[PDB]
Design an enzyme around this catalytic site. Structure first.
Site, PDB file in Angstrom:
ATOM      1  N   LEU A 159       0.803  -1.219   0.000  1.00  0.00           N
ATOM      2  CA  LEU A 159       0.000   0.000   0.000  1.00  0.00           C
ATOM      3  C   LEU A 159       0.828   1.257   0.000  1.00  0.00           C
ATOM      4  O   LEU A 159       0.582   2.159  -0.804  1.00  0.00           O
ATOM      5  CB  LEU A 159      -0.963   0.025   1.201  1.00  0.00           C
ATOM      6  CG  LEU A 159      -1.975  -1.120   1.188  1.00  0.00           C
ATOM      7  CD1 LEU A 159      -2.852  -1.128   2.434  1.00  0.00           C
ATOM      8  CD2 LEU A 159      -2.833  -1.034  -0.059  1.00  0.00           C
ATOM      9  N   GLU A 160       1.796   1.327   0.912  1.00  0.00           N
ATOM     10  CA  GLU A 160       2.688   2.486   0.978  1.00  0.00           C
ATOM     11  C   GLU A 160       3.560   2.573  -0.266  1.00  0.00           C
ATOM     12  O   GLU A 160       3.843   3.649  -0.743  1.00  0.00           O
ATOM     13  CB  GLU A 160       3.543   2.497   2.265  1.00  0.00           C
ATOM     14  CG  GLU A 160       2.744   2.459   3.573  1.00  0.00           C
ATOM     15  CD  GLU A 160       1.750   3.603   3.673  1.00  0.00           C
ATOM     16  OE1 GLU A 160       2.178   4.775   3.691  1.00  0.00           O
ATOM     17  OE2 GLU A 160       0.526   3.333   3.683  1.00  0.00           O
ATOM     18  N   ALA A 161       3.975   1.452  -0.805  1.00  0.00           N
ATOM     19  CA  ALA A 161       4.686   1.458  -2.082  1.00  0.00           C
ATOM     20  C   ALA A 161       3.800   1.997  -3.206  1.00  0.00           C
ATOM     21  O   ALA A 161       4.283   2.718  -4.071  1.00  0.00           O
ATOM     22  CB  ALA A 161       5.162   0.059  -2.441  1.00  0.00           C
TER      23      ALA A 161
END
Ligand SMILES: *[C@@H]1O[C@H](CO)[C@@H](O[C@@H]2O[C@H](CO)[C@@H](O[C@@H]3O[C@H](CO)[C@@H](O)[C@H](O)[C@@H]3O[C@@H]3OC[C@@H](O)[C@H](O)[C@H]3O)[C@H](O)[C@H]2NC(C)=O)[C@H](O[C@@H]2O[C@@H](C)[C@@H](O)[C@@H](O)[C@@H]2O)[C@H]1NC(C)=O
Ligand SMILES: *[C@@H]1O[C@H](CO)[C@@H](O[C@@H]2O[C@H](CO)[C@@H](O)[C@H](O)[C@H]2NC(C)=O)[C@H](O)[C@H]1NC(C)=O
Ligand code: NAG
Lengths: 247, 261
Positions: A159-161
């Site tokens: 998600l953060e990627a």
């Protein structure tokens, strides 16, 4: 379902997966001057979830429900079981994973919550291919000792990627170099500020691209860079999509 | 949510060679000229933005001084602009007078250069970074096959090589004038071809030109907005050791880049 397997986890396949995840999250996104897609909002609960399949090194597969409004995990499924975060929308269990034994996790889908429950921080939690793999396993069997750190790994690596090309690239470096890593101030300052950058970028429309507040983003040398406008490549070429914040 | 409507913000404005927009000698008289000067904390480099599209230092408004190009940009009494639409900053950092279309320009690079209103050609000398952090941003630039741009042949050429953390020639300094500079030699800028017969991107002495203005777009390209083209790996083949300027195409991944800082 969009999917990523430890069996076929090369820099290319990882990159394609992240690219497709962004694509799908940004269907029907709005746009401002900055050109960075703003995620959908006020989505009917029946349309609010994107399902993603993750498979570890031995054909054990979980399905994660991503809220399309905030690119966070609401819940996941393993075989005929499922697990819902406490702060998942209360109607979500009637819409996703309806034919499973549903369960409630006793912590929120936020880093703060997951860190307190698991007793461990992102700074001390390694990331990389093998951690991705093992995280899927521990979620598959729902070993409660490892569930919080498994989410720290998978939220960051998926998600953060998706949110930040910088973070996507940290994982690519990790695949290419065959070296795990812990997130430093650069990665954490992005994660921490996704919401605030979202607000400032949208708010900047009425101030010629200048922010109402400055946001500190660290570089790889642990130097802080003040981003008080949209004229920073380290924001504008990095943050792939935003949270809806302003009319 | 009033955070959505900030009433002001005070910042700096940096541009050519990383110098700042500066009201010369902090003079407050109408028509007092704006110059290029090394960046510091002084009030005459503090620029406050407002929702009426004014940009202000020392209580007065940044402004062109003529309809025709070539004249100084000045500060002047803000009541003289009550019926003017003001400034418009493009997403690439071009600061434009809305009525006249003249653009904030630095015709030379040296300290005390007078800033002027000029016709927009998207030169590096017409690119600015509005923000408090005025330093060049040091980074690697990742392209096709997860490789890094490297300055090669005595800082005259540029192409993709495997990323090596220690390797000093894979680092680039991103400047407030939208230049991409050799980190170890900040007089050298990544440059589109000056030879009409070639599309090859090279490294040359920074000169403020269109050839050296670059924009990192949100869609992941490195755009030269004046030449309406993007950086591209020739034939999508990193082994050819050639980066070129091409019109935007969805055909290959050779136009996709990442800033890793
Ligand atoms: C950056 O901007 C400033 C302000 O525009 C430059 O300065 C000005 O330059 C004028 C000539 O360019 C000065 O005019 C002289 O003024 C006396 C009376 O002031 C007049 O008797 C002179 O003949 C002359 O005036 C002009 O004559 C030519 C005509 O075409 C024109 O209409 C007349 O005005 C003027 O005082 C001056 N303004 C100020 C406040 O300084 C500045 O130029 C540098 O300094 C000036 C003093 C002079 O040495 C220039 O040649 C030199 O470029 C310019 N550049 C820099 C780096 O500061
Ligand atoms: C933007 O440019 C316009 C036009 O050059 C400026 O508008 C002129 O302002 C002068 C000085 O007050 C007036 O006498 C003229 O009548 C205006 N001309 C026109 C065509 O309207 C304006 O001042 C500039 N604004 C800024 C902020 O630079
Ligand atoms: C979980 O998040 C909710 C917000 O929906 C908050 O009100 C609650 O206090 C949080 N609890 C924990 C366990 O941190």
């Amino acid at each position: 379902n969009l999917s990523l397997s430890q069996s076929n986890f090369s820099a290319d396949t990882y990159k394609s997966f992240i690219k497709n995840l962004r694509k799908q999250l940004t269907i029907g996104a709005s746009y401002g001057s900055a050109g960075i897609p703003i995620l959908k909002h006020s989505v009917p609960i029946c349309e609010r979830f994107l399902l993603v399949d993750l498979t570890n090194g031995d054909n054990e597969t979980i399905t994660l429900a991503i809220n399309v409004e905030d690119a966070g995990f609401a819940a996941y499924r393993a075989a005929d079981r499922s697990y819902f975060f406490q702060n998942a929308p209360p109607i979500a269990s009637y819409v996703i994973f309806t034919d499973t034994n549903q369960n409630i996790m006793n912590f929120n889908n936020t880093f703060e919550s997951i860190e307190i429950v698991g007793g461990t921080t992102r700074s001390e939690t390694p990331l990389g291919i093998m951690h991705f793999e093992a995280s899927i396993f521990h979620l598959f069997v729902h070993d409660e000792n490892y569930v919080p750190t498994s989410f720290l790994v998978l939220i960051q690596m998926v998600l953060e990627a998706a949110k930040f090309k910088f973070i996507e690239q940290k994982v690519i470096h990790s695949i290419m170099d065959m070296e795990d890593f812990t997130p430093g101030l650069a990665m954490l300052s992005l994660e921490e500020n996704w919401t605030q950058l979202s607000l400032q970028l949208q708010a900047s429309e009425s101030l010629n691209g200048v922010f109402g507040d400055s946001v500190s983003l660290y570089n790889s040398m642990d130097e802080p860079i003040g981003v008080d406008s949209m004229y920073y490549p380290i924001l504008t070429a990095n943050m792939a999509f935003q949270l809806y914040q302003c009319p | 949510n009033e955070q959505c409507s900030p009433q002001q913000r005070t910042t700096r404005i940096s541009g050519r060679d990383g110098l700042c927009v500066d009201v010369y000698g902090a003079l407050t008289a109408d028509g007092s000229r704006v110059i290029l000067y090394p960046c510091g904390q002084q009030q005459n480099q503090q620029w406050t933005f407002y929702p009426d599209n004014t940009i202000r230092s020392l209580g007065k408004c940044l402004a062109t001084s003529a309809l025709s190009s070539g004249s100084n940009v000045v500060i002047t009494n803000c009541d003289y602009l009550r019926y003017d639409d003001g400034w418009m900053v493009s997403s690439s950092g071009t600061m434009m007078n809305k009525s006249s279309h003249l653009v904030l320009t630095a015709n030379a690079a040296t300290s005390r250069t007078n800033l002027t209103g000029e016709n927009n050609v998207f030169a590096a000398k017409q690119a600015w970074r509005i923000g408090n952090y005025v330093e060049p941003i040091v980074t690697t630039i990742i392209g096709l096959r997860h490789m890094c741009l490297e300055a090669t042949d005595n800082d005259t050429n540029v192409w993709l090589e495997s990323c090596v953390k220690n390797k000093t020639k894979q680092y680039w300094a991103l400047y407030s004038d939208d230049t991409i500079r050799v980190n170890n030699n900040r007089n050298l800028c990544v440059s589109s071809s000056t030879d009409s017969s070639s599309k090859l991107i090279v490294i040359r002495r920074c000169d403020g030109s269109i050839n050296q203005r670059w924009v990192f777009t949100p869609q992941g390209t490195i755009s030269n907005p004046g030449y309406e083209a993007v950086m591209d790996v020739a034939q999508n083949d990193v082994y050819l050791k050639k980066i070129v300027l091409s019109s935007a195409t969805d055909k290959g991944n050779g136009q996709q880049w990442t800033v890793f800082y």
